[PDB]
Symmetry: C4
Subunit: 407 residues, 4 copies
């Protein structure tokens, strides 16, 4: 068997972050940290699944807390965002549980499919798969932490500043009052307690991580797939000015076909996650873009909103762009195959060129759409159209302005 | 001749539900229950056509009843839905009469085209065609009955509750008063009578069945077509790791071409029904989605509206998804044909791959659009755009709220 | 030389209606009635060009009259329709002058290209080209005459009824007063005179004829091209169950390529006309659809408005559908070519199938769009979106209602 | 080495205008005027880069001047255009600096790629590359000068006329007062001085040139690329009725492939410039189209607005049309290759036809969209949709009308 310890494989590149996601109980797999991917299994009776049940239960408590709170105070387009957030996180937990069920099969086919690319004539690029996944994961994790850190600073400063500069109701600032104030939707159903207070803080942070891991997981998966397609393209580039034997083209076509089979298998497994992530990002991007003209009290509120908005747009763009790289990388070998000399031309090149030319090699949201650069352009155009129409809806609330600080 | 009694054919799978539709006189064919499809004929002078005339006449009476009533009370965007419903049902009767005229030719070509798939190397799947059609038909029929049952319960409870809790005009509840109240558009033109009262109830239920059978018929037809394409794909999957003789690929291509010819014949026959169903579903989905924010008096009204809305959206989605399965199943054999070894490669595979790759094998609305997964995504995007623009129109009536119960 | 007298050619099919258009000086060609198309020439110094100059001068007089009138009374979205109409008629005159300049070459290439289809193995269909063109042209001309007659009847009845039922300002009805009232935009610049009155009536009729003849000419050209494409399709259908020699396929491919070259030439010649017709039809359809909910005084006004709207929508739809018939007929031979046996298969069939599959054989608006059924569906969707957005603009004037009769 | 002095090369055609752009420090390249393109180099320590720093610094001063001014007086959808203009110009400077970095590589591959087309069997067209670039450049430069000349005349006349016909505040007209009045956003931050006054005038003119050179540069680049594709098409047209040796098709395919490689290299280098130009043009076209119904005081204001609007729309259209000519010219050789006789048919023609047919040979905005005629149609449709929705936003300000002259 191959030595999985040091090979540049996808499983080695993502397991550190898959295990990290298991800390918040995202995808409950057993033995995800094993060097051999064949040891990865899904078991309902396991510690990872138990933690997932705890997080799903507690997340449902927050969802019910928000649901009951909104009913008491009425449901408006601005309060509905909170309910959608918890609903999306709960859907993510379910989607990732199903993805956990299919992962052992996916990782097994992925490993045996990518073994040929770990040996010549394929060469490891300047930035290996582990480094590519780490940079994307750390960037998303780092930006997500800053986004949540700004959220807490913005909420805390707004709370304290309102009390301090009130010349009115004082309610001396404290951790207890802040929790009952900013998280009223929770404590309006459950009795307050410092133990519960920190639990809500941790689980809201966990919900934030889950909301961000959907996009991160798609990025790491996209990085792993476009990594091998790039290697195929690099190998083809080595044949630009040479007479190529028909055997070489047979291997290239077979490896390309195997990669396409793996993408189809991975696409089917992740079809629901892509669909959930795309709709979740579209709603929040549209929702946030509708509040760009709204007036906020403190500069920190502006900093958080624009950091949150830019990060959300950037995260959405890079999910599509990283996924679209699979499509772009597949078509990059076409330009070199078209330069094949007349003597080297054979049926295998004709077969390969036809497949690259006519096949859409990309991840898809249940085949309803394919993650390509054209789709991201279409998504941007769709968002602009929605915002132009939706901004008329928000004109009344926009002109009301910010409410009095004391009130 | 083949033994049609026990063969797994399309005619056997749909005739039980085609006959059921003939009870409400949808598609007036003679001998639809015959085991031999060659005995199915269309005759104007026949009992099925007579019943169709009766239902068409009575449905026209309801259409005129609604038309005259709206003129007396004015036509608004909310009352126009009732006129569209009866107009769509009448169009369905005409469309199905024309489809009845073409059915004998369609069922004859369908039967002789699918005979090859009833014998090896084609194998019956886990769920045969009869079971696939039954599950779809019973699900649609069962959901449609619940949708109408909720409509009657919602209407009856609203009627009785308004009278009971009025402390005002009493008009002691009775079957007679309910009929004159909720169905005023009928009795405002025809004299009331208990015999007419039940007739309106039955024919409105029949109109509901016809409105739902348009989508059901497209589903059963789509199930029958994707059934054979799936068998072709399954047969191709049996050749993944084998050296295939050129004769095998000749048969596969010929059977695939014959299936494509049948789809073209079926698509032309059903082009009007698909077009009518799509426009009918689009209007009602858009109309109902415009009333999600409206306030209803009783919880039963909310239950009916959301059951009606979700069922309508689900029915529309599954019509497109079931029809799109023909397109998806055609492209599923491409992945296996691309794995054909270099020795097994021949002109027949090249011909077949080119046809699968470049031909759009799907049902179409008069070729204006093709029922694919991309179209359903486009339909959803179009509906969202219309609702965002149309919700501005409905804002005034939305803020008026529900009227006083007694008034 | 071939006997042009009795051959089933496009020039024989269209020259009667081209001469009828010349009677209103649309396309000023010399010898359009000649049996030999080679005798058709474009000359600036000719009677047709003189009549075209006269009609253009008078149409410009009407356009300036409307422009000055609107400037005096202000320009509104409702008043701009007449200025757009006159500008479109003038643009049609210019475009048809250019098309006349290009027409000798177009007709010569068309004649030398369609000669092969006048002899076996091609057969004249049930409805020959002359009959198809006659049916289309007579339908369009009769509908346009009915539309203009309804317009005149509606205007005259409105005027006379306003005068008679006024119990107020009388201005006893007369031809002079009617002309000065309904055509004030003309006589507000030129002195009134009965000669000028009848001239204005005749020239407005001519403008209507030109506006309809743009679409009529597009229809006749589309019929002429789809005729030969259908002949090719029928010849291919004649080979469904036969072993075909390579020479037959060579001839079929050569004829198809010649037809495609002719289509490219005709599209280059008529791109400006197609673009102008499409934009004019889109604008007028949107404008008329924006007035469906408006309230008109007399039933004759409703009859005229709805006849005009339905005729305009049907004319646009039939222009698009007749043009897309070329694409449909080009693609219809693919189904039969795909059934070619393995023994009859050769390089020529592969070339022909590739051309039919990958080439878009259709008329285009300067290549910005191609007249296909997908394009008609997209046009319908775009019109729906534009109407949904614009009905908000017209809500105020819609709720203002009809003005007092006497006022 | 080839004699670059008199050869009809791209570098010779554009360097006169690239050098002119360097006067306003657009693309800081060293030795752009050298006959040999290999002498063109990019150096940060050079005079062209120094001038770019000066213009970038001063443009940033104007951007800050506008930014601070808007904050003092509030940011509105009408005031934001000025900030976008300076932001786009600054982005253009950065984009062109990066393009300057890549230009030496681009011009080197471009020169060696186009050498084959300077010798038979390729012939220089009626209008050589230098003439084609000159006509486009002079037209854009000439129209841009008129657009700015009208802007200054419109601003000066409005300023003087307001003072002269005021019967109120006089502030006798002078150069000093005009600068402090129309350019208050600058002098509200910097002290006024006649030296600064002219500097602002020159740099605003330079900013206008930079805003127009983005489109001009794309045009000249598009002209250079479609020039060689047209030569390939012309060479193929020379083989319409001849028996062609396989060697000829090898050369044609190799030259076509080399041209496609050059387009890919050029497209990647100019991907950011195309993206910036498209978004900049879309915003300004949409912004200006929103003010067509606004009322301006003097006719000169109307002349400037409509000259500015028509030029902006025309410039945007011709950028897309000139770029789309690369796509159109690539597909023009297909029609002749399809006429290749059966004896001349070979694998090379099949390879070439497949590439022309299936490859999208066009410039792209980072592959998000391709500059084709379909895209320009889509752009026009998108603009119409935005304007219809956005015109509702601008209705309030539209009905306010022009403010009092004295006020
Ligand atoms: O469901 C509302 C709930 O979300 C919280 C949880 O901490 O904030 C998260 O969700 C927001 C979007 O709804 C994000 O903007 C934010 O970054 C994220 O932390 C709370 O704001 C709220 O209680
Ligand atoms: O035409 C209005 C008419 O439709 C009825 C007939 O029973 O209800 C049917 O049509 C509704 C949509 O218009 C559906 O929501 C409903 O499920 C269906 O039964 C009556 O409501 C009405 O008289
Ligand atoms: O330009 C306005 C002018 O058009 C007239 C001329 O008879 O009517 C023609 O144009 C209308 C659309 O603007 C059509 O509806 C009508 O069918 C056609 O006759 C007059 O209405 C008007 O003076
Ligand atoms: O940034 C606003 C600034 O642009 C100026 C600079 O002269 O005018 C240029 O920009 C306008 C669009 O914003 C163009 O219409 C105009 O043609 C161009 O000269 C000034 O108007 C203004 O100070």
């Amino acid at each position: 068997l191959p030595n999985y310890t040091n090979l540049d494989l996808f499983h080695r590149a993502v397991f550190p972050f898959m295990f990290l996601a298991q800390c918040v109980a995202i995808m409950p797999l057993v033995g995800i940290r094993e060097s051999n991917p064949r040891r990865v299994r899904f078991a309902y009776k396991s510690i990872p699944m138990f933690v997932t049940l705890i997080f799903m239960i507690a997340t449902s408590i927050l969802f019910l807390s928000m649901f009951t709170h909104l009913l008491k105070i009425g449901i408006t387009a601005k309060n509905f965002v909170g309910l959608v957030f918890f609903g999306c996180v709960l859907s993510a937990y379910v989607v990732f549980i199903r993805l956990a069920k299919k992962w052992p099969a996916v990782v097994r086919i992925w490993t045996r499919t990518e073994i040929p690319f770990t040996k010549p004539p394929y060469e490891i690029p300047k930035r290996n798969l582990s480094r590519r996944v780490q940079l994307a994961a750390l960037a998303i994790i780092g930006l997500s932490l800053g986004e949540h850190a700004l959220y807490q600073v913005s909420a805390i400063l707004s709370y304290t500043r309102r009390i301090q500069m009130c010349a009115n109701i004082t309610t001396v600032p404290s951790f207890n009052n802040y929790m009952q104030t900013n998280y009223d939707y929770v404590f309006q159903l459950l009795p307050y307690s410092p133990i519960i207070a920190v639990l809500i803080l941790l689980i809201n942070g966990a919900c934030t991580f889950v909301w961000n891991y959907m996009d991160l997981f798609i990025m790491m998966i996209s990085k792993g797939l476009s990594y091998r397609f790039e290697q195929i393209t690099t190998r083809i580039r080595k044949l630009e000015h040479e007479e190529v034997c028909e055997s070489v083209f047979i291997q290239i076509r077979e490896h390309y076909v195997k990669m396409c089979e793996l993408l189809e298998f991975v696409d089917s497994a992740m079809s629901s996650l892509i669909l959930l992530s795309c709709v979740n990002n579209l709603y929040f991007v549209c929702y946030q873009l509708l509040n760009v003209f709204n007036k906020l009290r403190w500069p920190i509120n502006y900093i958080y909103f624009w950091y949150s908005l830019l990060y959300l747009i950037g995260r959405t763009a890079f999910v599509f762009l990283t996924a679209a790289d699979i499509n772009e990388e597949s078509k990059r070998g076409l330009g070199v195959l078209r330069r094949v000399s007349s003597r080297s031309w054979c049926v295998e090149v004709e077969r390969l060129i036809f497949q690259m030319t006519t096949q859409t090699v990309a991840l898809s949201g249940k085949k309803f759409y394919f993650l390509t650069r054209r789709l991201l352009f279409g998504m941007a155009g769709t968002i602009v159209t929605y915002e132009l129409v939706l901004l008329q809806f928000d004109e009344p609330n926009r002109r009301k302005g910010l409410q009095p600080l004391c009130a």
